[PDB]
Symmetry: C3
Subunit: 174 residues, 3 copies
């Protein structure tokens, strides 16, 4: 059952849901909180590696993630990151988000951007009970033209769903 | 908490959820209402523009949407729209949908079509409290062959989730 | 309203949700049950067909699915399936899943894999009330390198949502 805008505001006020920085009324509507584009980007540089083995522990999958992804790319004031057709890029939300053990988050991308080819998780839109941090984003340009993204733009929408009870093993405790 | 088929039928009957035209019992099952393909299509013609700037207000993002997308394409009786591999196309549901301030919709594409490469929102599957209208669809052909789509085919599935309370700023009031 | 880990464990214990084989505590966390990669794969071989017509009954859409998809591919011990950039492949979960008429499932892919290009449903992540069986998976490699998948790896995450009441026409009864 999704929280409506007014109840998102309630859970924020009680300190049971945290979002930093806290988005104003303008960005809390219906059943979502708008989220923004951060300033840390990553792209592929595949030439060092033949493939990526996706089986095997987090450490292998994370070691791989860094052997083939570029250095962090931080954009100045003004600057846009251009995501070219058929490219997969990694980014991050501006907002940090902390969920309690009895809420689950869902990130939607924006539909108006999807229509121009911007694909955002997509595969895993779930923010877990106990998640605390920025949300890592994967973009895919499914469109015909390059898409310019600037830090601070609206990039997605969080909605929040109470669980049937507080989770015994939330993200933070494992 | 999703409405089951019987309760979708209830909310339709009370006039608290509206779907036009109203789908018969055949198309209301489990926790979804089947939706159909409309008859308004759009494709990319990128050659006029170098890129699309996705930051900046709706009007810019919508101005862009029309500078680079084709004219509306309306298909006769018989006719199919062929969505070619790697193409992003825009379409619309046959059904209009109106949600009240205390329901949120989710559009799924059909799994049997996804298996042949048909990707449908995907990024933003959320229909908001207060949404009233057709649902704009983005298709992406992730497969190897062209996919023929005909107006009237089943194209997706709506499910409906009550909010924790009626939303203070639903879509219609902003 | 999603079941938390403890309540997923409850519904499993009561025999109201079934997952075979039953995943241990390690794979039931927050609001999800981890699911694994099975051992039945399929790829496209498009050269026999010009297109696929996606309108027309299940039997046509399923006839098509077999005229253009390869034979079942079963991988030995050791073996990896390599999903190459821009390829759409079909697979299956290791676990069989049975839902009752008053629960709906959602499959997420894993975010750490999505970041390396692994796209999993994506378009239809919904497991219906009354669904009983393996879950068919479509993968898409949106990344730059090939991705190696091995049977038994974690491939996704199931979450479960009670309906507003038991569904009158669940999947099994139609
Ligand atoms: N695939 C979709 C998804 C949403 N919509 C509709 C339904 C929603 O109430 C609105 C807003 O969706 P969303 O917030 O993701 O779009 P914006 O880019 O913020 O305008 O558009 C649609 O027409 N087609
Ligand atoms: N990725 C998926 C999604 C759904 N399924 C299963 C689970 C659901 O109960 C059914 C129906 O899903 P869906 O309505 O989207 O598929 P259809 O094209 O209408 O047959 O198939 C699956 O095997 N793999
Ligand atoms: N697009 C996303 C999705 C999830 N996350 C966060 C939120 C979740 O609590 C975690 C776990 O997501 P998930 O189980 O799909 O990822 P793993 O591959 O299992 O580590 O990561 C994210 O940063 N970006
Ligand atoms: Mg919005
Ligand atoms: Mg998602
Ligand atoms: Mg269906
Ligand atoms: Mg979606
Ligand atoms: Mg996980
Ligand atoms: Mg999905």
């Amino acid at each position: 059952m999704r929280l409506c805008d007014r109840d998102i505001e309630a859970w924020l006020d009680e300190g049971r849901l945290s979002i930093n920085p806290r988005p104003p009324v303008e960005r809390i509507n219906g059943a979502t909180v708008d989220v923004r584009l951060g300033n840390k980007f990553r792209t592929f540089r595949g030439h060092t590696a033949a493939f990526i083995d996706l089986s095997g522990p987090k450490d292998e999958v994370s070691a791989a993630l860094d052997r083939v992804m570029s250095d962090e790319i931080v954009l100045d004031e003004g600057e846009a990151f251009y995501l070219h057709p058929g490219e997969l890029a990694l980014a991050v939300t501006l907002e940090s988000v902390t969920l309690p053990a009895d809420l689950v988050g869902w990130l939607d991308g924006r539909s108006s951007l999807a229509r121009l080819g911007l694909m955002v998780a997509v595969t895993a839109h779930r923010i877990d009970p106990g998640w605390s941090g920025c949300i890592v984003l994967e973009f895919y340009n499914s469109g015909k033209l390059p898409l310019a993204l600037r830090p601070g733009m609206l990039i997605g929408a969080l909605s929040f769903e109470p669980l049937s009870g507080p989770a015994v093993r939330p993200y933070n405790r494992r």
